[model samples]
Target chain A: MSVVLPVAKRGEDILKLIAAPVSANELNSNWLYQLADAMHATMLERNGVGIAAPQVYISKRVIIVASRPNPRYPDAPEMNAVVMVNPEILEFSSEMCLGEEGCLSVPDERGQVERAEMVKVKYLTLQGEMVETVFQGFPARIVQHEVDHLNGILFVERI
Target chain B: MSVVLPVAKRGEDILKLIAAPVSANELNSNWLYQLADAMHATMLERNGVGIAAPQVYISKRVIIVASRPNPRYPDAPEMNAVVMVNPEILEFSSEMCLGEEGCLSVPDERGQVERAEMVKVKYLTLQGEMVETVFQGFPARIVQHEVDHLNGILFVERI
Candidate 1:
């Protein structure tokens, strides 16, 4: 069965409120897997490069970054979907780039948002293992966009 | 195992040749499934909205149309991936709309192509069962694009 969930819109309370981090109990069970799978499916269904749990009415610090070339980002590099739990940006580049961005929560609109061209990030895996990685270009854009969701910040706010 | 195949580039011989129709024997076995799966994977990996068999060096009448809102198409509609076999455009509406299109074969390029606003298409399923459907808007654009691949034509030609 498809685990696709309904996405919360821009005006929804969940989109504006800060999301909670994944709990130990949630990580120890299949809950994270189901949530991640559902988010991934929804992202693909909507043709979004990334999605946040808050967009689905789940107030958690979880986001899926799956960058791919699409109508909006024709030159975007494709990457496998990464389920980031409690993702945080450790560092941002001094340089910034302007790129077009859209949100599942904010539909039918797009903006040229300025973002750090590269970032160092730390996030937990579904298994609760911590991982630190650096991202650049479109993938970096996606990481920043998703992390913003966890903080209840929409791309429009940054625009 | 991942079956993602390398997409044939724009100047490749395979992309220039008109793809052949899926034979009855090919559809009767697991061959079509494997090809379709690989195409789907490649499409998702490259963040393509649709793909053709010829794009993956398979000169056969197969295409996958999975339209979703992406960077190039912020207003695109979401739809499940439809694997079209031996596909043909039966009818097209007189009204046309210009939309941005990108190709996996022609990487790093995008074009504004005019396409039918609506189209009637006929194709066979993996089971070789005939199916007919009507597509409009972005989905219609995808159908025209993929159908062009079967005819060994690229969107750049229309642009």
Candidate 2:
């Protein structure tokens, strides 16, 4: 449905745009699938560990968690690319760890941010089933960061 | 011994120059330790996962294996920042994977490159003791990439 969308950077209006949630009827549509594929492509092209729909200037609660080996993450455990629609955090661990974060929208700069060591989240699978799962360590961080995008929040703002 | 030394860019003389092995007497010395700190600072400031002394124009076989969560490595496992001197690769896995890589010196670009899935290496610790070890996953990749810098190899050349 789209080529690689130009990644909206920090000053761009789309980046600060609050994305609307995808409705049940639109969950499995071809448009969503194509948009997912395009977001995944752009994430890989930019070597991003995760990316959100807003990053592509689309106001929808779509995110892709794709992590692998890259200059920035040479030792990352291989993860199957996952597409999450309307993901929401269900729980946050009291324990926290400080880790650095960077955004495709916020290029060339990064800041150390504190994140829950673990989190339980509920989100719709591409198949439209709600899946509640616990994520820890790196994946947990990626999920938290991407969810913030749906709220029109930036990592820098969180940091 | 020096503050974060200026990072030598892709076409700069320092980036392409092969570094010399540090002398035994210099290993673990105060001067080496200070230089190590400065490189660490630069690596952190630039959000780089790894760096080598040659990147700062010092012809020394010294490198820092530092990885943490950053824009480039959000899912990276937390690894203690490690300093290696006169490091050499003893073995590389027959298995390989392609991962994207960027350089502080090579600014504003990253490319996919093939790398061993894991590696074994021997290097002098900052305490001056020679140690042989195996690193897998992300740390392994960081070790290999930084060691390549000592040989004046750039990730672009590898790609």
Candidate 3:
């Protein structure tokens, strides 16, 4: 069965609290995949471009950056949903650009946020393999946004 | 009966062409209300914060700014949907602020766009009554974004 979890709002304790990093034992179990799947389903059902674990009331360092053309965003790029665990930004380009951002938690509000134009991120895949990747443009923005959630930061705070 | 029209993409000719103003006869007929309802339904179905008439392939000066809490925006303020026809921005505040913006027609990409902190707008209601109102913050951004569509302008152009 597909799981579509309810998203936590801005004032929720889960959104304000820092998420714990994924553990070795949790990575070995099916729990990680299930959590990622549930987060993805919740993101899609909510029509959000991305989602973080804490947004779904889970205090874990997991996020899904799934960009696609939806009614909310017609020109969004198509990419396979990437499930990231214990994600960290290894480096950020000094070049910063402003982009408009909305949060599932922040709702109805959008602000121009300055972020690195490119980011080097280290994360683990659902299969327990460590991966490092460089993301630019819209994908980069999504990464930075989701990473903030793991740190208990909302996009509004950056405004 | 309800109508949910298809939203035009960025490359569509209708999106590139400037929209014509609503005529007095058009306002007098039931056509305007049906069109408004269809546009409103389209915006809601797509999970958009606002929409322009040209977005639905109607090249007329009309838009609907309906903001509410949803899965996509869980903290959005609840307000009755406002339908505007032949809308015009009469005055813009000297103070400007940067805010993030997304468009249903422009799709997956969002950018930080600068806009007036407040605006005074004049528009006709669905009942053809002339009205002027001031909008600030998120609502103000929506009005500017939708108004740009009426002029064949997309949010990306301002980016």
Candidate 4:
């Protein structure tokens, strides 16, 4: 079953605010689970590779990075869905690649942006476990992309 | 290196026309190779999982289905990019599944549509070899969606 929320577009206030961090106290809340599922469904429904909570008009530091190809992206690298709450980037590689990027909130046009080839991130899962993981290639780009959303930055701003 | 093409939108005339068929003689032409490369780049840049030649303003019976996770579709199913030319659907399953779908031509929204759970398709590969293959799951959905474009059908029309 899919749970879709209305997608917030560019220029919307939700797209610009720095999302509030998810507190440890809120980790076990049903709200988080519902938000996660709703974002998941919304991301897949829109053919988006990743989505931030803010993209759904929720200003929370939560994101779902499911790196799979769908109708929108045909050559995207595949990765297990990574749900990050209160996420932070720990490391960035010296190597960089300029890849074209598009945003779910900002659609139609895409721009060339340079991203680190590798990244290490620390995040809390819905299961209430804190985990740190490293990602490379497309997955690395995805992590960085979502983290930017928490910082109130859009891909166009990076470009 | 990336070769981004101008993506067609819903109201564009290209999105509505039935694409022209490709002859065997045209398989080895530079135009086809360039189209394949450009389509591949455009697919990645726009974070799309698949693309038809017509979407790039070339009315040809060719498409690329490369399913992997990307920023736009993090939960999309992972599959190697499949380039098909002069494609045809040879079979469809009796079972169908309703999946939420979004289109590159139609941005910002998605709709639920029913699609075959499995499909068999025949097409000319980039090497000019005719091949037949069966696909299931999300890849099956991707294949069916692109094939529709060859017939000048959109996902909205399917819905």
Candidate 5:
């Protein structure tokens, strides 16, 4: 069954935004820790390609992402779901395409969202370290969703 | 070093205490799905014994609990974390005592929390069906923690 993970209703930010309209006003570090943990728990329940803090009811700029094949996301790679805190877009690929996207925030609302099929992502590691790395295939898709959560966006909002 | 998985935090009442209390709930089925996948990623990253939903910061009552002697939970058995939703004490053995408790939720906190040395827990299987069984040693401790998250509580809170 396409179960609906209890997603956030329209409310105040449960955690914090990675890069809101401004920088100094973005999410802090301590809350990111809690959001990360929540994402872990929530993802275990959802069986998603990746998850973000906003999906877990914490409106923070945090995400725990992974891509691999199991019962869920059968086409995923073996990459671990890496954490991104206060993430930002470093760059995008020359080409973009629409792909199926799902969100913990938007339960059972998988849709085709336009995104760079192959791209590099820049974000913070779990402990708040800044890093930029490239990803493709399922890993890239997972990162794209999680980083979107950090920016107060969802897969549905992808351009 | 422990890492958290991504999950949907908002849409679950199954993991949290239901309107009324029951021994268990039918798991936030959606959350359970993502949870299995995300925890798979988390276990891969840190080689952990278990990863509960609350550890990742989702307050839903569920866990991606496993017992194995990986670098994370050395001396543990090779049991996969039973994806449980709102599990409760179906029964308990007379063996009860304070056992050493540690958590991915509060890393700095550790202590002895009282629990049934061995227990029979009624919970959901990975396929999200109700089942009842007994667990001894580490698995029991994990169940204790998993149940606690459903009450909007944590192992550290017990201390």
Candidate 6:
């Protein structure tokens, strides 16, 4: 019943953006699945492999992963992205370190922010199910950072 | 706003580490309509896809996408076993390499981490935007290592 709103294109603004969460179990949203549609549009338009709720200006804790080998990330491990919601940190290496960091809300000023080199997290997917996992290296960082946006915080805040 | 219980698994911890904003938009949360809030649970429960919420945890945004291709990760990139959220770069070197990586989730693990040398990214896909990006050999390293787990995180966290 909602309309699909194109999300902020890359280099634009991914701050304070929150996705309109849709009821996976409900048929009332048979029309456009606005949130999902918007996420898909904005993600593809920006050439991003994935997208999240906060990045779209919606304050809900959610994300959409469409990761795959792309023109930019050609050698990137082939993997499709999916949407997630209310993600939570489960466990991580105490070895928090800083890596190049930036944010949709906090732009232009990118720097290093200390984060767990390896981590384990739990969250609900777009289809709605609890999935727990552990990540290491780069992907681990990604998971931790995007979820931060949902909390109304920016990368610079950590730096 | 009914608070669904937060998830905390065994042997998991939260540490502040940064990957990078990767890519995304920063529109105000009002970008979509009001339906954003409704999907929180579905993204967390019913479909069983695996999602998180910004509302749950505070500080430094993050998300760990485990898009296992069994029906859920149809669109997700087929990685070794991972999908990132706010991914970042670490020590990327033009000197490429590959090593078996491991994660905490898989319990007994065996995997590999292959990467180029340098890579860069920045954007919030949900809003169709690039929040930030960079390349340095680290992207390849991180991507390779993380992707090794989408199907299942394993390898074994070694010092």
Write down the TM-score of every candidate: 0.51, 0.53, 0.50, 0.52, 0.46, 0.41
Tens digits of lDDT, candidate 1, B1-159: 887888788887777788888988987477778888899999998788999988888889998888888886778777768899999999899999989888878888887989999888888878675666667778888989998999989899987
Error of 3 at A82 (Å): 0.5
Those runs of model 1 whose alpha carbons end farther than 4 Å from true positions after fitting are B1-159
The digit string of per-residue lDDT tens for model 6 on B1-159 reads 332323212232211112123222323333221232332443344332333322222112333333333452254334332223444444345676564433333335546555565655442434434345443432344443443322122234321
User: What stretches of model 6 exceed 4 Å from their correct place?
Assistant: A1-33, A65-78, B1-159
CA lDDT, candidate 3, residue A61: 93
Candidate 3 chain B: worst-modelled 10 consecutive residues by lDDT:
B72-81
Candidate 2: tens digits of C-alpha lDDT, residues A3-82: 77788888887777779989988877887788888998888787789999998888999898776667776765576677
Q: What is the lDDT of residue A66 in candidate 4?
A: 84
RMSD of each: 15.7, 13.4, 18.5, 14.3, 12.4, 22.9
Question: After aligning candidate 6 to the native by TM-score, how far in Å is the CA of A124 from where it should be?
Answer: 1.4
lDDT tens digits by residue: candidate 2, B1-159:
336668888888776777898897887688888888899988887788899998888878899987666787655544567789889999999878777778888878988888887789999988799899777666778888888889888888886
Model 3, A95-130: lDDT tens digits are 787988888888778789999978999999887789
Q: Predicted chain A of model 1: TM-score relative to the true chain A?
A: 0.95
lDDT of 1 by residue, A12-128 (tens): 777888898898888846888888888888888888889999998899999998876567555454455788898989999987989888998887898989999879999999989
**Cα lDDT of model 3 by residue, B1-159, tens digit:** 988898898898888788999999988578988898899888888788899999988999999877667775575555567899999998888999788777878777878999998877888888775656667667778889999999989998987
What is the i-RMS of every prediction? 14.3, 9.2, 16.0, 10.0, 10.3, 9.3
For residues A39-117, could you state the per-residue lDDT of candidate 5 as single tens digits?
5755767676677665544434666667767665666567766777666667778677667766655655668777776
Give per-residue lDDT, candidate 2, residue A119: 82
Write down the TM-score for model 5.
Answer: 0.46
Ranked candidates, highest TM-score first: 2, 4, 1, 3, 5, 6
Can you rank all candidates by lDDT, best first? 1, 3, 4, 2, 5, 6
Query: Which residue segments of model 3 deviate by more than 4 Å?
Result: B1-159
DockQ of each: 0.02, 0.02, 0.02, 0.06, 0.06, 0.02
TM-score of each model's chain B: 0.96, 0.93, 0.93, 0.93, 0.70, 0.31
Residue A113 CA displacement from its true place in model 2, Å: 20
